[PDB]
Amino acid sequence: MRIIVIIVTDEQKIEDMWEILKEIGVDRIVIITSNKQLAERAKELGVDRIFLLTDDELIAEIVKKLGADIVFSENRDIAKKIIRKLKNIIILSNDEQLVKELQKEASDARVFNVQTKQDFKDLIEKILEHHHHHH
């Protein structure tokens, strides 16, 4: 029980760790998406932990059952939809104007903000040492 809810935003795709994704990744991640396209792509990789749902707030009930303690997703409304039942979950969102709302209104809710590479650098330094390959 340490599964991360991977909801994918169309930004810089992690194709770097796409290989190790099948060894370490699928062991501790679940692919939660509304797009069958990348859900099939992950299925061609051999990701067993995939849910395809075109619903917004329903993910709060899905991850409740999955016992998920973390989610990567841009979600303003759906943040409060998850937090109202789960204040023990750590949610990352890009909108700092929203992240602060959840940090004030919810007592035990651990809501972290991402803006620039700094937020990612500190976060990866907190967790296990993971470096990127220069060229």
Q: Which domains does the chain have, with CATH numbers?
A: 4-126 (3.40.50)
Q: How far is the CA of 23 from the CAs of 13, 29, 130, in angstroms?
A: 18, 11, 16
Phi, psi torsion values for 130, nearest 5 degrees: -130, 115
Beta-carbon-side half-sphere exposure of residue 103 (alpha carbons within 13 Å): 11
* H-state helical runs in 68-127: 77-83, 96-105, 117-126
Name the structure determination technique. Answer: NMR
Q: How far is the CA of 39 from the CAs of 13, 26, 58, 126, in angstroms?
A: 14, 13, 18, 30
What span, in angstroms and rounded, lies between the C-alpha atoms of 25 and 15?
Answer: 12
